[PDB]
């Protein structure tokens, strides 16, 4: 089991850490949502699916920088929604193919009501998402840690 | 099969990730190349050359930060040249000795016409190069992920 990012990098068997740079809507008004869809960015696969089932959770999601201070939101993982920053590990999603498949994580973020002007700075860390991978085969229990960065400023107009 | 960097770190049998810092020409004009030769830094060896042949490709090369935004380039891998960021996995290089041999990868980067001022920041991630290793012996298929960082600022004069 290993993962890769779009036009990007890989975190190999055994886990590790990587940076993911995402383009964000440049303007988001109070009452609109900023959507950070990692399912187009992070892809994973099972290396021996004919005998091994891989189990993958979002063990934890935390907010940083402008997202931490100026937005509130939720995280959607494989079709269910949870608080973000997270309060517990999600249910497992099964990976059972050698073909790269999306990690089905998306953040749905909305400006706090007093936010105005530059709410997220270009180049800044906005989130850390920990993918936890286990299996039905051995004692493997690995973390794949994704540091998520904004490529551009996001402005909340006034 | 494992790899190390000169005065540096190691990625052991089975693959993994490591960080590599490179010195860059401090001033580079439109129409000139920054040459980043990793073959003097990254070295690999075969752990059982008497019965095993190791096959090593450049699986993917990706650009980040100032290189992604301010440069275009190519990669030379074992005597052939390709676009960088890459568009496919290269042909293989054979490793058949216990003696350290260079991984023969070099990047040639040239500023785009909008580059001006500090086009690459000191300390910043500039590229990821993924070495994929297999053999003629078993099912081993491992990735060695090299994160390339700039040691110094590179300026594009205006
Ligand atoms: O002889 C035939 C074979 C084989 C094979 C054995 C283990 C293995 O582990 C990785 O791939 C597994 C499956 O994706 C993971 O569950 C492990 O955590 C680990 O990443 C992958 C392939
Ligand atoms: O009885 C003596 C023996 C033996 C032996 C079997 C496998 C092996 O794998 C490593 O070294 C091999 C050769 O470098 C690699 O192809 C593998 O992927 C792995 O890194 C090394 C030695
Ligand atoms: Ni694989
Ligand atoms: Ni060795």
UniProtKB/TrEMBL annotation, chains A, B:
A GO BP entry: cell adhesion
Q: Which residues of the full protein are shown?
A: 10 to 167 of 227
Recall the taxonomic lineage recorded for the source organism.
Bacteria, Pseudomonadati, Pseudomonadota, Gammaproteobacteria, Enterobacterales
Disulfide feature: 3-44
Cellular component terms, GO, for this chain's entry?
pilus
Protein's recorded name? FimH
Q: Which gene encodes it?
A: fimH
Domain FimH mannose-binding spans what residues? Answer: 3-147
């Amino acid at each position: 089991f290993a993962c890769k990012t779009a036009n990007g990098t890989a975190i190999p068997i055994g886990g590790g850490s990587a940076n993911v740079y995402v383009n964000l809507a440049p303007v988001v008004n109070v009452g609109q949502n900023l959507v950070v869809d990692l399912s187009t960015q992070i892809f994973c696969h099972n290396d021996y699916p004919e005998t091994i089932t891989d189990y993958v959770t979002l063990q934890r999601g935390s907010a940083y920088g402008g997202v931490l201070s100026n937005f509130s939101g939720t995280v959607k993982y494989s079709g269910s929604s949870y608080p973000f920053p997270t309060t517990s590990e999600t249910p497992r999603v099964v990976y059972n193919s050698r073909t790269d498949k999306p990690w089905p994580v998306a953040l749905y973020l909305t400006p706090v009501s007093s936010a105005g002007g530059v709410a997220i700075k270009a180049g800044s860390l906005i989130a850390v998402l920990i993918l936890r991978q286990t299996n039905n085969y051995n004692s493997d229990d690995f973390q794949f840690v994704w540091n998520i960065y904004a490529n551009n400023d996001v402005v909340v107009p006034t």
